Amino acid sequence: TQQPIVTGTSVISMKYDNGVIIAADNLGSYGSLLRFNGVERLIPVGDNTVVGISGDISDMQHIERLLKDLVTENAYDNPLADAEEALEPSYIFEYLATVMYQRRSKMNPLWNAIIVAGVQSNGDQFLRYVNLLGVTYSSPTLATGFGAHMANPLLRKVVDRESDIPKTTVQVAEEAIVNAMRVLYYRDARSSRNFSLAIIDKNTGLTFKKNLQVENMKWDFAKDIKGYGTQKI
Amino acid sequence: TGYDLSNSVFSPDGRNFQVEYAVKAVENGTTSIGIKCNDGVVFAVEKLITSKLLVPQKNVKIQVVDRHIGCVYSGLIPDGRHLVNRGREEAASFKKLYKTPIPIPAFADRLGQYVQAHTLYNSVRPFGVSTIFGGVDKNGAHLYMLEPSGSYWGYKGAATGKGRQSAKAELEKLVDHHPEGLSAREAVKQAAKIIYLAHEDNKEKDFELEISWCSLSETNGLHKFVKGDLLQEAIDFAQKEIN
């Protein structure tokens, strides 16, 4: 029994025809104080998986160490560690899900919501969610926090069921993701302008973009808004 | 007497005969070596081909610890594995508490203290392996060799197993002829040669060669196995030298 101190807000993600995209901003809030500004919440694992984490940052940092120790452990007495016996996204997920549910069952949770995005060895897209209760689910789009409320509806307009995935390109998907990040910056009081984005493609591999910014913001209409009802000047 | 029937008993000269008997098991094993180089270390070992039926390349004997340390050993293979498992737990616990990967001297004493602990009681048997290990840390490259007694030191080069003497002589020539240093790619070649030379003392069955290395410039300070073009290139340089 626990309470989150330093926290990260939404993590959003979707499948497209050849892969998966996932994004999360670079802020570590301390309640309403926007305390830390260069916080990386997407953590790559090998060249085929990105784990995106929201919630308590001390627990996120613990999960990083678990994942980086997992890579080390998997290389041990494994001559195929960078080939047929490399860590799959599904292996990494099941491990994290196992841990999350055990910790909730001991009444001492890791206060996080997690999305594991990647491509399996057979080229299949992987996207699955797990949180502090050990609840898990998969969907063509996935988001945590405010992301679930504001991103999912936007990303679902692009991919609304399984059959929309072959029809969606990496340019379309990234655009939808980048737009959702802007919306969250307008509307979520614990978001930041700066974010990271990662694409995991069955052909181009893992591309990891840092220091992105929300751009193309409409603020001009603000000049016309006066008072709260009757005030004219 | 009967001073030699129980581990941890001092004989009247002040020896622990059970450890000395463990050394005999080590001398009976296949040859393995390490060469310290300019910015790294190289490990190699002789794998006797017992039969046609062994799958070539698929019975690996050099072992990684953490991401920056290689270990090879001669003697009872399972004992060596047990020691490396302990080394891995020790490395994880150091990294967990201190964040930085375990320094090689630090790692060497963890293995040493653990091996030495198995000479303290009559309820355990000493380790039947000598272990050559090392890698690269913030202070450079380090090579170590560790005996069943728990004795270890830092080495310029080291060898153990049946061909330890032939290898030792071969290593000594390199240390005399290269007081400025040996390069990593150079050391890989020499390693192949010495394993081939040292295979003289064990020539019933023919053998499969296995090499690994850590170099600040050639492997980025990580432990990797030498395979493919670089392996065959060094097998050939060895072939050339026995003829």
UniProtKB/Swiss-Prot annotation, chain A:
Membrane-spanning residues: none
First-listed, main subcellular location of the protein, grouped into a coarse class: cytoplasm
Keyword Cytoplasm belongs to the record: yes
Subcellular location: Cytoplasm; Nucleus
A Pfam family assignment: Proteasome
Role, per record: Non-catalytic component of the proteasome which degrades poly-ubiquitinated proteins in the cytoplasm and in the nucleus. It is essential for the regulated turnover of proteins and for the removal of misfolded proteins. The proteasome is a multicatalytic proteinase complex that is characterized by its ability to cleave peptides with Arg, Phe, Tyr, Leu, and Glu adjacent to the leaving group at neutral or slightly basic pH. It has an ATP-dependent proteolytic activity. PRE3 and PRE4 are necessary for the peptidyl-glutamyl-peptide-hydrolyzing activity.
Further comment: Present with 16900 molecules/cell in log phase SD medium.
Entry's family note: Belongs to the peptidase T1B family.
Protein name, as recorded: Proteasome subunit beta type-7
Organism encoding this protein: Saccharomyces cerevisiae (strain ATCC 204508 / S288c) (Baker's yeast)
Encoding gene, per UniProt annotation: PRE4
UniProtKB/Swiss-Prot annotation, chain B:
Cysteines joined through disulfide linkages: none
GO-annotated molecular function: mRNA binding
Domain of life: Eukaryota
GO biological process: proteasomal ubiquitin-independent protein catabolic process; proteasome-mediated ubiquitin-dependent protein catabolic process
Note: Present with 12000 molecules/cell in log phase SD medium.
Subunit structure: The 26S proteasome consists of a 20S proteasome core and two 19S regulatory subunits. The 20S proteasome core is composed of 28 subunits that are arranged in four stacked rings, resulting in a barrel-shaped structure. The two end rings are each formed by seven alpha subunits, and the two central rings are each formed by seven beta subunits. The catalytic chamber with the active sites is on the inside of the barrel.
Protein name per its UniProtKB record: Probable proteasome subunit alpha type-7
